[PDB]
Symmetry: C3
Subunit: 491 residues, 3 copies
């Protein structure tokens, strides 16, 4: 009756979600999204990375050429997957610095092997063992050559192999440690002596040590495995009087992005960029709590099992019953916008969404989602993060480096989400305040602020008039005479 | 006279404290609290962690069973404390990879030892030395067995010990390096030869080397110490023709949270969660500058010696002498609240605190104190961070890892406190501004803003009227006629 | 005509720069500065750090005393620079743990050597080789002493050297591995046997191994290099029957801030605190993308090639043509301040800068520049970050530590600049808003807000009157009668 009411407000939802900001440990917002990936399918997807499932073979078994690993010859991988069931089924061996040879072959990503014609004049080649059956016959590691006496002579070997290629050569070789003095004479025709394998830049001398070790697959002897990398222009020289498990050639050694992972997860026909030992995981989220061991474009590992990013404003219940604006009060009935107007005039009570303010909030929230979602970075060969044996110093360092990293990332994640959520609350509160201020400024002296997010408009203000305010075309001068008379009247 | 004044304000204190924010390198606030712990009592509290004071013994001396360490037999610890006065008082020895054996025993946290009956048929057991006195008699390491010839024979040993337990066994053994060829024959009846200690998964061969070393406690000979871990289902095999310092059994090897620390701090009868080499430190603060070496629930080490967290608003002097509000002006006389009202009316000049605004600020400050104070996390065995010898590569890495970590934490601490302090200044400024806005809205057209944080109320406004404003029950309509007449009058 | 207009505004520039904030991926500001150093001069400045250019010598070659390195005797450095052209020109050698000896000498920063008189009674000293020419004559490493038989006898050596100094001694020594059994007898008069070098705290036994290696500078033999540090109160004991390459004395070993760097950059006569392999770089900026390898007071390495810090407000085009204020509108014509006033009155249209607001913004921006610019911290000897050989485990860890560090710093840099830029936008927006509010408060009921950052002043307001508003001396009471009549009139 001679006046109207115009309220500014924002939506509210019946099912809000709790997030953390800098101001509040817990504040309910209209919507949020999870930033920590905590589930895996449980399978390793065979795309888009080239997976090599080791099955019963370790990488080192496949390198040496254990008969059950013959199918692996010359294969390449992005990721070699080693299974806990894996077992050796040839001559018992050890590798001093096993972890390093495993790592360097894993990182190279290839088992490509080129045979070479070493001059083994004066000895017997191709020694075999019942401990290493191939197609039901006594055999040996495919890539190694067990040399033994010929006619009870084993003349001193002094054998050369130049690298005349433009790439490096990786040589794998070994030293046989016989169980008894009888086996030594029976195999090499003389007492044990050192083996020296050298290049222009390196030398390795190894002493065969006769003696029974506990039997493994009925064998009390051992082979110790060594490696030598030979550069272009360098030469491999092998010097021995027995006990030599000779190379048959060299492996290519490449550089690139290959690695190795211990997992029992099945390999599936599917496509996922991020692999963990638990299986492939989606990489849309910036963080994950599935496993510290990862390969590919992966979220970063954090300790938190959930971090919720606000994707809407503060959620505020509608106060119980005269229309009312945003002051301590959301509008559950506003479903076509985030901010808007309610009015009361001669023609009834109405509501309209404000598109500009709503879109400004939505655009900014989508902006931060764009920075955080689907933006993971790739990592490849790293360090080991689980250990089956006690080792002391080096392992203490590996563990401390990883613990240190995870705590720093977990801190960055916690702070980032608290800061972003505070900013979301601030920017959404700000759109509400700006809408209110813009309206106040249009109305000039024709309205008063009622203190509840509403204006009392001191003139008849029909539907078109209200629309003019909402649309930014209200001309205050048209109504000012009427309004000033109504406002400043002695009652 | 026909009008009143109502001012909004906030407290101020005579003794404020300087903090850093994002906006200001130095800003005075009413109160602050220290976040960096920089003092220790100087003693290690014997509760709640199980402390083992090594006194004159290193952990390795206590392991081997140096006579002065007999009291340590079978003890466990959370933290083994090694003293700089510690010294060896038995046969001179070295441990290749001493640091790793020390670390693995420290982390295991137990000296539990189980004797076993090795079959040493054909040799003399229990060799003793004047360099290792026990109760004034020639003796030897309690856990080791010095075998020597019997009737001038030392038959080849080939001795086995199966692990039929469900847990791992740690074996400690040694190789004696005699000073002279005479001692070799006198002890073992024959020239030196290798010792091989093996399992199904490992082998270690060690060569005794005869020769004088510089005398230590009058002994030119040495013992070199080795270790072997034997898994359930595996077997220890010892193969020797002399120079064997044999094990008498095995140590349990456990996993858990135990460690070792070098400190000369006395042990006290007190209770503290965080231990450093300088002594236990309180763990209420999130950061500390006492020592990078810590054990237990400890603040994080940072380089800063002080970081002050604001726990009150900006501290603003009261301007010198008509009442005045918060614009460039604090109220030292307001002692029962942080924010409030001063008024001038017919009945005098009065002050009242506003509880709501005051409590809102206090609650939020207490919130952040709750996140930061008494919330430290536990760490246990880590890496070494001080070194008595020059070593090169591995030590360079250990040092770089720790330096890297400390610089990253020191940065996080600096940023966190600057951000929190900025937020405290913002939230306390905001409570003042909201109080002023709420008041302005109640007053409607009955008052004007004087620009100094005060309103000129254009009607008679007695004590009850002022109280109604403060209490949120002022009805502007009652006074509007009077106020509009006073405001809009030709003077 | 009976009224005036007063607009508040801020400057704008024709050539703004894009930065990133928390709110906007891209926002144009009036000015910015680069925080990532991405160029080097290409030369290493010889000041203020003491540089030692290795030229054709590695540090280890200079240590041993290869003839071409004689000029390096006893020199010290802060930074030893090793060139890729460097080559050895003496007897072929290897150093087991080369990387550690290189590191410990590099970090010590001195080649100071003190000769000592070892008692080599019974052997020939000063062996020479055609592979190691000095001044066209057969020679040998300057710091080593090749002992050979005397009259076809080489009596067992058992030689002592006490450390009676107050500092540690570094001894470098070697073992000769002859190409053939003939050379062994010709040099040492008997078959090879072990060398033992010991102290009270350490022992090292090395076995000479006869055999041809591939010829290097026509030599099939090798020398293997070892080192021993002897403490005050300890004694060096050398025990040998041949193959000993003896020390002539000891190196001082110091602690301090020295290091070593691989670079081919020329050394220049200039002064720069920060050295990288690409050359010295300026250290004004907090970050750099030139090289992860640094020495001295250096910006921190990050992955980003640019991070722009805002040093001015948001840059907003001037809207096209009645004066207008800051609402969606900058003033390109304001060149003597950042914020100001434009007015329209009886005497024309004028502009004046507001010094206070302008200086408040400038001071705060200079504050953050002061924290970020010219504030780098020094680092010295670190870890290696590039590798010429494949090694496996230890190298994997070194690489992972550095990758981890760089990713954490790159994250901190990205967040810091986004936060600072958001704060700059906020503080500059705030100065504009405060200026507007201060003005509004002075005007009281004499003006209305037109919604475009301008006031309509409802009285005649001449140049002095406008000046009084700008200067903060406007007395609203003088004009209130006139203004209220103009505002509240029936039109
Ligand atoms: C609460 O917040 C969420 C993030 O803003 C939001 O999830 C987003 O929803 C959209 C639409 O469903 C998804 O986008 C999809 O839309 C196109 C349409 O053309 C599809 O073709 C695409 O496949 C695309 O996936 C987003 O993926 C999704 N974003 C995230 C991070 O989950 C929810 O909708 C919001 N919930 C409520 C109740 O409002
Ligand atoms: C040193 O001690 C070792 C452990 O006692 C011993 O190894 C054991 O040797 C026996 C006999 O060869 C093996 O027993 C085998 O006996 C028959 C022989 O026909 C076989 O058919 C069976 O397979 C049966 O296993 C043990 O297996 C073996 N024990 C271990 C742990 O390896 C060495 O022989 C001894 N060495 C010397 C040089 O005497
Ligand atoms: C300045 O800021 C400090 C942090 O807000 C504040 O210190 C806090 O003071 C309280 C009360 O003295 C301490 O809490 C104690 O109160 C209960 C009462 O039931 C005692 O029973 C407990 O023992 C408890 O310790 C807090 O410990 C203390 N907090 C911190 C972090 O120090 C100061 O009081 C403030 N100073 C001024 C002048 O206002
Ligand atoms: C190789 O050289 C070593 C150093 O010269 C030498 O060690 C020294 O041996 C002497 C004589 O045994 C010790 O001197 C001791 O002399 C009397 C003997 O009755 C003792 O009562 C005293 O305690 C006195 O110390 C030295 O202590 C000892 N020096 C060191 C540094 O250990 C070796 O004996 C030599 N080795 C051979 C095989 O000849
Ligand atoms: C845009 O932002 C830049 C940072 O605010 C600013 O650069 C700064 O400019 C000053 C003045 O040219 C330089 O300071 C120099 O001034 C004294 C005068 O006594 C000289 O004697 C000194 O040598 C000193 O270098 C600053 O060095 C410089 N700061 C930085 C970080 O670059 C630009 O001027 C600004 N550009 C525009 C167009 O406004
Ligand atoms: C073991 O095999 C080695 C490689 O075949 C061999 O080394 C080679 O020795 C020959 C002959 O001494 C060297 O050839 C040199 O021949 C004349 C001799 O007058 C010299 O003037 C030339 O400089 C020419 O180089 C090879 O250089 C050398 N090859 C390598 C790679 O070092 C060893 O001699 C053999 N060892 C034994 C004990 O027989
Ligand atoms: C390396 O090869 C050389 C031969 O090229 C070996 O030297 C011969 O060894 C035999 C058997 O011990 C001796 O009878 C000959 O007199 C040696 N020949 C020469 C020319 O010296 C040498 O033993 C091999 N080395 C090793 C460690 O196996
Ligand atoms: C390991 O033990 C075996 C015996 O079980 C040793 O072999 C005997 O050694 C003696 C003395 O050298 C010889 O006379 C015998 O002929 C060997 N017996 C057999 C069955 O071969 C062997 O020496 C021990 N090994 C070590 C390194 O000590
Ligand atoms: C270390 O020095 C001692 C002498 O001080 C050497 O022992 C002598 O060695 C010779 C030659 O082998 C023997 O004939 C003598 O009988 C030994 N003398 C004594 C007193 O035992 C010993 O060989 C040297 N050790 C090494 C590894 O070179
Ligand atoms: C692996 O070994 C198991 C156990 O011997 C065997 O049954 C299985 O068939 C093997 N798998 C492959 C792929 O060879
Ligand atoms: C993944 O495997 C690790 C290692 O066994 C386990 O700790 C973790 O709970 C697993 N996570 C999920 C989501 O399966
Ligand atoms: C736009 O403005 C006009 C008045 O100029 C108003 O009547 C109309 O309803 C407005 N349209 C909308 C969609 O708000
Ligand atoms: C430790 O050794 C010192 C020096 O011999 C001795 O006086 C002290 O009593 C010893 N302390 C213990 C606890 O055995
Ligand atoms: C603690 O001990 C360390 C190491 O000696 C020393 O640097 C530091 O000053 C000590 N700190 C305190 C508070 O005693
Ligand atoms: C509460 O409001 C009444 C007026 O309705 C006022 O007079 C009274 O003083 C107020 N009480 C307080 C404690 O401010
Ligand atoms: C380094 O070696 C090269 C190649 O022999 C030589 O020409 C040059 O003069 C040498 N430089 C110095 C400084 O000795
Ligand atoms: C510096 O050298 C490194 C290593 O070769 C190279 O990657 C980088 O591009 C160089 N940077 C500059 C600015 O020259
Ligand atoms: C200062 O204030 C006076 C009026 O009191 C005004 O007329 C004068 O122009 C002002 N000066 C400036 C520099 O603004
Ligand atoms: C092993 O070498 C022999 C030469 O003795 C060669 O002819 C043969 O092809 C090889 N044997 C096998 C089974 O590959
Ligand atoms: C050492 O072993 C003997 C067997 O020779 C045993 O009887 C005795 O208990 C042991 N000696 C000591 C002092 O413990
Ligand atoms: C090497 O030692 C001899 C003693 O045999 C000494 O006189 C001479 O100075 C030394 N020779 C050289 C070339 O320095």
């Amino acid at each position: 009756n001679s006046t109207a009411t115009l309220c500014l407000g924002h939506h509210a939802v019946p099912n809000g979600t709790i997030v953390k900001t800098i101001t509040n440990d817990q504040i309910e917002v209209t919507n949020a999204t999870e930033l920590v990936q905590s589930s895996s399918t449980g399978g390793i997807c065979d795309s888009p990375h080239q997976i090599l499932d080791g099955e019963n073979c370790t990488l080192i078994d496949a390198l040496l050429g254990d008969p059950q690993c013959d199918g692996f010859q010359n294969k390449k991988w992005d990721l070699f997957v080693e299974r806990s069931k894996a077992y050796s089924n040839c001559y018992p061996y050890d590798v001093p610095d096993y972890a390093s040879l495993r790592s360097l072959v894993a990182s190279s990503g290839t088992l490509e092997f080129n045979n070479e014609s070493f001059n083994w004049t004066g000895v017997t080649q191709n020694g075999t063992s019942s401990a290493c059956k191939r197609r039901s016959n006594n055999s040996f590691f495919s890539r190694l050559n067990w040399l033994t006496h010929l006619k009870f002579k084993y003349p001193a070997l002094n054998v050369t192999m130049p690298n005349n290629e433009k790439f490096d050569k990786l040589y794998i070789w070994g030293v046989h440690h016989p169980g008894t003095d009888n086996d030594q004479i029976s195999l090499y025709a003389q007492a044990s002596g050192r083996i020296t394998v050298s290049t222009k830049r390196s030398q390795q001398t190894v002493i065969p040590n006769i003696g029974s070790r506990p039997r493994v697959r009925d064998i009390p002897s051992r082979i110790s495995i060594y490696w030598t990398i030979v550069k272009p222009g360098d030469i491999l020289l092998i010097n021995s009087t027995g006990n030599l498990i000779a190379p048959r050639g060299y492996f290519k050694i490449r550089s690139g992005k290959s690695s190795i992972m211990r997992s029992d997860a099945p390999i599936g026909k599917c496509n996922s960029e991020c692999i963990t030992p638990n299986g492939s995981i989606p990489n849309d989220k910036p963080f994950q709590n599935v496993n510290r061991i990862t390969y590919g474009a992966c979220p970063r590992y954090v300790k938190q099992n959930t971090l919720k990013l606000a994707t809407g404003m503060r959620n505020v219940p509608e106060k119980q019953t005269a229309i009312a604006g945003f002051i301590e009060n959301g509008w559950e009935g506003m479903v076509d916008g985030w901010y808007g107007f309610r009015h009361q005039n001669s023609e009834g009570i109405g509501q309209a969404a404000d598109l500009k303010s709503t879109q400004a909030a939505i655009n900014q929230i989508n902006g931060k989602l764009n920075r955080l979602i689907g933006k993971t970075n790739e990592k490849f060969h790293q360090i080991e993060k689980e250990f089956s044996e006690v080792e002391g110093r080096i392992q203490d360092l590996e563990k401390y480096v990883e613990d240190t990293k995870i705590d720093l990332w977990s801190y960055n994640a916690e702070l980032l989400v608290a800061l972003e959520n505070q900013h979301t609350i601030d920017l959404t509160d700000s759109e509400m305040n700006k809408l209110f201020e813009r309206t106040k400024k249009q109305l000039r002296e024709n309205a008063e602020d009622m203190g509840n997010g509403c204006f009392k408009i001191y003139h008849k203000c029909d539907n078109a008039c209200i629309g003019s305010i909402r649309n930014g075309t209200y001309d205050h001068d048209v109504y000012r005479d009427e309004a000033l008379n109504n406002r400043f009247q002695i009652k």
